[PDB]
Design a protein. Structure first.
Length: 479
């Protein structure tokens, strides 16, 4: 029962906690050598039973084997490899398109599989300079898609599942794609992608949207120019581009520091238009979504960049305007009125960042989908949970019910309470993937669908409840 036959050959998995797991399955040919910076290609078939008991290496990233360009692998968890057509949850990890992997223990699919009788798939996709180096036409038409290779890898993994998941006990016609932060931005992009249309039935976006980390061609090209200089690669020198060692190319890129931000590029080749705008044109009509945000998420960014908490009010405001401005005066007045008397100054203003980077994107996405007539379920995660990371969503452990897993901010205190919230989110996510509706007795009260009329959203906290148009006042302040 551990051996499964796919279109490319047989795979041997292993038993774990009562469920079956297959690790390190290649979903595309290794993008090394002459295949570097090129779209993903179908993996080569093999004879015999390939071992799928160990995770494959993770993609190149700043550093269990060592990171490698040969990291296009996926992992599968299932109650049993049969023909029960179970819902399929396809996870796209976050990490600012810079680091991370589907093999990280906090994404272990055992709980979802065991508690919901669903199949779970987690993947790796090319990141940073290997997956998002926008070359444009600088090195020829063959590399015109280099700026979005990470997205293309995700699509290639999705096609592999659509084509082979049935053998692992999953239903190819009931795939729900979900992700957090950069992973949610990836979901947002795929929702708008013609090439991915029909590959999945539903989507869930946790603290992210198609606008998160999205770059314009001009912006992306400017970054590429700096990277190539640091790497000693002359524009148009395909030879050096392909022979430079992976570690050296990665070091060159990282030396630019957190100034360089990776992400999808509306390059007119892979992404023809803004991911959210596309939704307005029906790119994802008929695709239900569950979407939400982590309360005051940008505060978490000050942990990685303390500079925000050491700027004068005027000096802080200017930095915000530079990054997400222009900020209308109506908005400023709103934030001064809602400020917390006991909280430091920067916390008042950083709320502008939380809104522009996370809330607006979610609201635009929900409004676009609702306008198309598709069901939308919106939420705000308020539970205060403890904490070196690039992205800062906080729902993950509760959604995956991986509170035990190592690496997780597992600290003493409120065990029963942490369990209650997990039992609410875990099962609501399972219900959405199963039937397109997160409702059930696992929720203290009904979670109404998001409509322009009521704009209802579920609030997950120690005492979860429904709130009508909670972002209303704030939105009005800007619009």
């Amino acid at each position: 029962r551990t051996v499964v036959e796919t279109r490319y050959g047989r795979l041997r998995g292993e038993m774990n906690e009562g469920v079956f797991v297959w690790k390190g399955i290649p979903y595309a040919k290794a993008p090394v050598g002459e295949r570097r910076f090129l779209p993903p290609e179908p993996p080569d078939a093999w004879d015999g039973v390939r071992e799928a008991t160990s995770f494959g290496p993770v993609v190149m990233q700043p550093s269990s084997e060592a990171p490698s360009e040969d990291g296009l692998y996926l992992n599968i968890w299932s109650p049993a490899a049969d023909g029960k057509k179970r819902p399929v949850l396809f996870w796209i990890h976050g990490g600012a398109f810079l680091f991370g992997s589907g093999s990280s223990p906090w994404y272990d699919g055992t709980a979802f599989a065991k508690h919901g009788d669903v199949v779970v798939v987690t993947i790796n996709y090319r990141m940073n300079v290997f997956g998002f180096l926008h070359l444009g036409d600088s090195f020829g038409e063959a590399y015109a898609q280099a700026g979005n290779l990470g997205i293309l890898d995700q699509v290639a993994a999705l096609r592999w599942v659509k084509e082979n998941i049935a053998a692992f006990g999953g239903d190819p016609d009931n795939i729900t794609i979900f992700g957090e932060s950069a992973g949610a931005a990836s979901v947002g992009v795929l929702l708008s992608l013609p090439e991915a249309s029909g590959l999945f039935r539903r989507a869930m976006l946790q603290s992210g949207s198609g606008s998160l980390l999205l770059r314009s061609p001009e912006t992306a090209m400017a970054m590429t120019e700096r990277i190539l200089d640091k790497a000693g690669i002359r524009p148009g020198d395909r030879e050096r581009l392909l022979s430079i060692p992976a570690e050296e190319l990665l070091r060159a890129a990282l030396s630019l520091g957190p100034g360089v931000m990776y992400g999808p590029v509306v390059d007119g080749r892979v992404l023809r238009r803004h991911p959210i705008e596309a939704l307005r044109y029906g790119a994802a009509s008929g695709i239900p979504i569950l979407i939400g945000v982590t309360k005051d998420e940008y505060n978490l960014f000050t942990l990685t960049d303390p500079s925000w908490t050491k700027l004068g009010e005027k000096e802080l405001l200017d930095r915000i305007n530079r990054e997400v401005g222009p900020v209308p005066e109506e908005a400023i007045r709103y934030y001064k009125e809602t400020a917390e008397p006991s909280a430091p100054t920067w916390q008042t203003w950083l709320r502008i960042m939380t809104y522009r980077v996370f809330v607006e994107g979610m609201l635009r996405t929900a409004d676009a989908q609702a306008a198309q007539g598709a069901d939308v379920y919106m939420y705000r995660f308020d539970y205060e949970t403890p904490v070196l990371k690039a992205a800062h969503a906080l729902e993950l452990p509760f959604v995956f019910h991986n509170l035990h897993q190592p690496g997780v901010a597992n600290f003493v205190g409120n065990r029963p309470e942490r369990e209650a919230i997990a039992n609410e989110m875990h099962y609501a996510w399972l219900s959405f993937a199963r039937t397109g509706d997160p409702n059930g007795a696992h929720l203290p009260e009904a979670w109404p669908a998001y409509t322009n009329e009521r704009k209802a959203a579920f609030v997950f906290s120690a005492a979860s409840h429904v709130e009508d148009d909670p972002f209303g006042r704030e939105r009005a302040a800007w619009q």
